Amino acid sequence: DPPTFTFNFNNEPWVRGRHETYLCYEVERMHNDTWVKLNQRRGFLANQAPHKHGFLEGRHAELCFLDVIPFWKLDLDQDYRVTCFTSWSPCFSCAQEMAKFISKNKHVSLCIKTARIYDDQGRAQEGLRTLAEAGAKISIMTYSEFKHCWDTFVDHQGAPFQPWDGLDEHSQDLSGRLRAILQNQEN
């Protein structure tokens, strides 16, 4: 057979927030002081809008699952068990908003293992610290959690996907930054 593989998750652009963004998530509906789930889906698609009919601004992972919450329309005492797997930690307004819903109430546990993000300081740090501090537990899902990212949302668990050195660069970035952003250690 001819050795021809397609890598859309590699270094090659495939997120940039909105638009055809490769993203994955996992959410559970917490009820009766416990945890439960009433759906069968692992990860997410590489685009916006989960279903058809009803889409204007679009949901980029952050507000995506955030939408799945009102989708269940829990009572109130319930809790949001949401987990995300994106190629980037936050988003300017997508995260700023997300952060709110999560920072506007104490009852939403999240684990966003993101690949990596690169921003100067302005027009990005807002959704960064906000969503990352009062929005969810953002993890640096680079080369390491990347291989695992597969082991969690792949039928084969860790598909034969080759990692790019950039992961070493980005990983080191998203991580070291995420520490500076959340900690706000200005130095």
Instruction: Enumerate the known binding-site residues for Zn(2+).
Output: 60, 91, 94
Least distance in angstroms from the C-beta of 68 to Zn ion: 16
Our CB check for Zn ion shows the closer of 29 and 60 to be 60
Catalytic residue set: 62
Q: Which stretch binds Zn ion (CB under 5 A): 65-73, 94-102, 111-119, 136-144?
A: 94-102
**What is the x/- site pattern for Zn ion, positions 104-143, by CB under 5 A?**
----------------------------------------
User: Closest residue to Zn ion, Cβ-based?
Assistant: 17
Asked if 91 touches Zn ion (CB under 5 A), the answer is yes
Helices (H), 77-140: 92-103, 125-134
**Which pair of tokens denotes residue 137?**
């537990």
Q: What are phi and psi of 93, to 5 degrees?
A: -95, -25
CA distance 56 to 163: 35
Asked if 63 touches Zn ion (CB under 5 A), the answer is no
Q: How far is CA 137 from CA 13, 110, 112, 141, 175, in A?
A: 24, 6, 6, 12, 13
CA distance 67 to 58: 10
Site for Zn ion, residues 1 to 60, rule: CB under 5 A? 17, 60
Q: What are phi and psi of 27, to 5 degrees?
A: -130, 140
Q: Which stretch binds Zn ion (CB under 5 A): 3-11, 44-52, 86-94, 139-147?
A: 86-94
**Which of 15, 23, 69, 94 touches Zn ion (CB under 5 A)?**
94
Which segments are annotated as binding site? 60, 91, 94
Whether the CB-CB separation of 85 and 23 falls below 8 Å is answered with: yes
Instruction: Residue 7: name the closest of 166, 144, 119, 113 by CA.
Output: 166
The binding site for Zn ion (CB under 5 A) comprises 17, 60, 91, 94
